[PDB]
Amino acid sequence: TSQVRQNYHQDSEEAINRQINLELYASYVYLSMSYYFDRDDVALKNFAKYFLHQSHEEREHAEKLMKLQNQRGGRIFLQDIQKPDEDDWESGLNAMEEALELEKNVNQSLLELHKLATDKNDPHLCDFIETHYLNEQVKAIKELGDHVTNLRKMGAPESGLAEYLFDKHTLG
Amino acid sequence: TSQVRQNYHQDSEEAINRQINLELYASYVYLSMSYYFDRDDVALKNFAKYFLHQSHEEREHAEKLMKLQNQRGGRIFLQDIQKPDEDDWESGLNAMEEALELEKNVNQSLLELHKLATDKNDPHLCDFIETHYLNEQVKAIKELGDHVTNLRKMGAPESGLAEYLFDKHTLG
Amino acid sequence: TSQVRQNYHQDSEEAINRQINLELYASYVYLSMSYYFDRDDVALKNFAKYFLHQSHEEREHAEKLMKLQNQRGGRIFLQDIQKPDEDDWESGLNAMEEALELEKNVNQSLLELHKLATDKNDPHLCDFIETHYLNEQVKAIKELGDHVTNLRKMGAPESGLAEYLFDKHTLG
Amino acid sequence: TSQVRQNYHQDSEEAINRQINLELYASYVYLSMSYYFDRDDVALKNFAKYFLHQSHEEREHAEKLMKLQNQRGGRIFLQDIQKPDEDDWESGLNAMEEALELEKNVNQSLLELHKLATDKNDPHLCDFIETHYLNEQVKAIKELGDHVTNLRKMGAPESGLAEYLFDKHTLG
Amino acid sequence: TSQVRQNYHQDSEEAINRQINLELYASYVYLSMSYYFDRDDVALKNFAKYFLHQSHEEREHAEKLMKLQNQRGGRIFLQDIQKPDEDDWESGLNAMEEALELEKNVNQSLLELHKLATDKNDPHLCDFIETHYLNEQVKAIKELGDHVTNLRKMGAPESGLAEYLFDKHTLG
Amino acid sequence: TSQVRQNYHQDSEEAINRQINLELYASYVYLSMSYYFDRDDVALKNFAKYFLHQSHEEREHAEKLMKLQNQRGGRIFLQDIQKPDEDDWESGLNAMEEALELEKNVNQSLLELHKLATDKNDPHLCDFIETHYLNEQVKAIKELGDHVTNLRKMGAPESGLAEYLFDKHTLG
Ligand SMILES: [Cl-]
Ligand SMILES: [Cl-]
Ligand SMILES: [Cl-]
Ligand SMILES: [Fe+3]
Ligand SMILES: [Fe+3]
Ligand SMILES: [Fe+3]
Ligand SMILES: [Fe+3]
Ligand SMILES: [Fe+3]
Ligand SMILES: [Fe+3]
Ligand SMILES: [Mg+2]
Ligand SMILES: [Mg+2]
Ligand SMILES: [Mg+2]
Ligand SMILES: [Mg+2]
Ligand SMILES: [Mg+2]
Ligand SMILES: [Mg+2]
Ligand SMILES: [Mg+2]
Ligand SMILES: [Mg+2]
Ligand SMILES: [Mg+2]
Ligand SMILES: [Mg+2]
The values of phi and psi at residue D102, to 5°, are -60, -50
Q: For residue D52, how far is the Cα from the chain centroid?
A: 12
Q: What is the CA angle B134-B138-B142, rounded to 5?
A: 170
| d(C-alpha C145, C-alpha C143), whole Å | 5
DSSP category for residue A134: I
Whether residues E78 and D59 touch (CB distance < 8 A) is answered with no
How many other C-beta atoms are found inside a 10 Å radius of the C-beta of residue F87? 12
| d(C-alpha A76, C-alpha A67), whole Å | 9
Is residue D81 classed as helix, strand or coil in its secondary structure?
A: strand
Q: Which among D32, D69, D80 is the nearest to E83, CB-wise?
A: D80
The values of phi and psi at residue D81, to 5°, are -95, 110
Q: Which among B134, B139, B145 is the nearest to D3, CB-wise?
A: B145
| Separation in Å, CA E95 to CA E32, E88, E158 | 10, 9, 14
How many other C-beta atoms are found inside a 10 Å radius of the C-beta of residue B93? 23
The values of phi and psi at residue C69, to 5°, are -55, -50
Distance from CA of D66 to the nearest CA of E (A): 7
Whether residues C66 and B35 touch (CB distance < 8 A) is answered with yes
The beta-carbon contacts of A42-45 under 8 Å, at least 24 apart in sequence, are: A44/A92, A44/A163, A44/A164, A44/A167, A45/A167
The contacts of residue B93 (CB under 8 Å, 6+ apart) are B148, B151, B152, B156, B157, B163
Max Cα separation, chain D? 60
Chain D residues closer than 8 Å to F164 by CB: 150, 153-154, 165-166, 169
- Note whether B52 and B32 are within 8 A (CB): no
| Separation in Å, CA C114 to CA C12, C127, F104 | 9, 9, 88
Q: For residue C144, how far is the Cα from the chain centroid?
A: 12
Q: What is the CA angle B157-B161-B164, rounded to 5?
A: 90
Q: Which among E43, E161, E168 is the nearest to B149, CB-wise?
A: E43
- Note whether D71 and D79 are within 8 A (CB): no
Q: Resolution in angstroms for this experimental structure?
A: 1.6
> Which experimental method was this entry solved with?
X-ray
The DSSP annotation for chain E comes to --TT--S--HHHHHHHHHHHHHHHHHHHHHHHHHHHHTSTTT--HHHHHHHHHHHHHHHHHHHHHHHHHHHTT-------BPPPS-S---SHHHHHHHHHHHHHHHHHHHHHHHHHHHHTT-HHHHHHHIIIIIHHHHHHHHHHHHHHHHHHHHTTTT-HHHHHHHHHHT--
Whether residues F67 and A39 touch (CB distance < 8 A) is answered with no
N- to C-terminal Cα distance for chain E? 50
| d(C-alpha D141, C-alpha C100), whole Å | 63
> Which domains are assigned to chain A?
1-172 (1.20.1260.10)
Segments in chain F forming alpha helices (H): 10-37, 45-71, 92-119, 123-129, 135-154, 160-169
Q: What is the CA angle D116-D118-D119, rounded to 5?
A: 65
Q: Which among B38, B70, B83 is the nearest to C78, CB-wise?
A: B83
| d(C-alpha F150, C-alpha C135), whole Å | 81
E7 — alpha (psi -120 to 50), left (phi > 0) or beta? left
**Can you give the C-alpha Rg of chain A in angstroms?**
18
| d(C-alpha B78, C-alpha B55), whole Å | 18
| Separation in Å, CA B5 to CA A108, A126, B2, B19, B112 | 12, 22, 5, 19, 22
- Note whether C24 and C63 are within 8 A (CB): no
CA dihedral D119, D122, D123, D127 (to 10 degrees): -90
Whether residues D80 and E82 touch (CB distance < 8 A) is answered with yes
DSSP category for residue A170: T
Chain C residues closer than 8 Å to B77 by CB: 87
| d(C-alpha F95, C-alpha F29), whole Å | 10
| Separation in Å, CA F42 to CA D50, E31, F35 | 21, 41, 10
The beta-carbon contacts of C5-12 under 8 Å, at least 24 apart in sequence, are: C5/C72, C5/C73, C5/C74, C6/C72, C6/C73, C7/C121, C7/C122, C7/C124, C8/C72, C8/C73, C8/C74, C8/C122, C8/C125, C9/C120, C9/C122, C11/C116, C11/C120, C12/C74, C12/C113, C12/C116, C12/C117, C12/C120, C12/C122, C12/C125
Is residue B39 classed as helix, strand or coil in its secondary structure?
A: coil
Segments in chain B forming alpha helices (H): 10-37, 45-72, 92-119, 123-129, 135-154, 160-169
| d(C-alpha A42, C-alpha D142), whole Å | 48
| d(C-alpha F167, C-alpha F46), whole Å | 5
Whether chains F and D touch (3+ CB pairs under 8 A) is answered by: yes
The kind and range of the H/E element at D12 are helix D10-37
CA E132, E138, E141, E142 torsion: positive or negative?
negative
Please count the residues of chain B.
172
From the number of C-beta atoms within 10 Å of its C-beta (0-12, 13-18, 19+), residue F113 rates as buried
CA of A101 to the centre of ligand 17 (A): 63
DSSP category for residue B133: I
| Separation in Å, CA E51 to CA A103, B4, C151, E37, E135 | 53, 53, 66, 9, 19
Amino acid at E66: M
Chain D residues closer than 8 Å to B114 by CB: 123
Amino acid at F162: A
C86 — alpha (psi -120 to 50), left (phi > 0) or beta? beta
| d(C-alpha E75, C-alpha E55), whole Å | 25
- Note whether C16 and C112 are within 8 A (CB): no
| d(C-alpha B112, C-alpha F92), whole Å | 54
Chain F residues closer than 8 Å to D154 by CB: 160-161, 164
From C86, C73, A149, A5, select the one nearest B39 (Cα to Cα).
C73
CA of B144 to the centre of ligand 4 (A): 42
**Can you give the C-alpha Rg of chain D in angstroms?**
18
How many other C-beta atoms are found inside a 10 Å radius of the C-beta of residue D17? 18
| Separation in Å, CA C80 to CA B83, B84, C28, C61 | 5, 8, 11, 17
| d(C-alpha D75, C-alpha D18), whole Å | 12
Question: Between B and D, how many residue pairs show a Cβ–Cβ distance under 8 A?
Answer: 40
| d(C-alpha E2, C-alpha D101), whole Å | 31
Is residue B81 classed as helix, strand or coil in its secondary structure?
A: strand
| Separation in Å, CA C91 to CA A136, B67, C87, C102 | 29, 19, 12, 16
CA of A140 to the centre of ligand 10 (A): 6
| d(C-alpha B59, C-alpha B67), whole Å | 12
The DSSP annotation for D126-144 comes to HHHHIIIIIHHHHHHHHHH
Is residue A81 classed as helix, strand or coil in its secondary structure?
A: strand
Could you tell me which residues of chain A have a Cβ less than 8 Å from any Cβ in chain B? 100, 104, 107-108, 111, 114-115, 118, 126, 129-131, 134-135, 137-139, 141-142, 145, 148-149
Please name which ligand lies nearest the alpha carbon of D59: 7
Chain B residues closer than 8 Å to D70 by CB: 142
Nearest chain D residue (CA) to B119: D121
Q: For residue F98, how far is the Cα from the chain centroid?
A: 11
Q: Which among E41, E42, E164 is the nearest to B154, CB-wise?
A: E164
Amino acid at B22: L
CA of A23 to the centre of ligand 4 (A): 5
Known binding-site residues of E for Fe cation equal 23, 58, 61, 103, 137
Whether chains D and B touch (3+ CB pairs under 8 A) is answered by: yes
CA E151, E152, E155, E156 torsion: positive or negative?
positive
| d(C-alpha C126, C-alpha C133), whole Å | 10
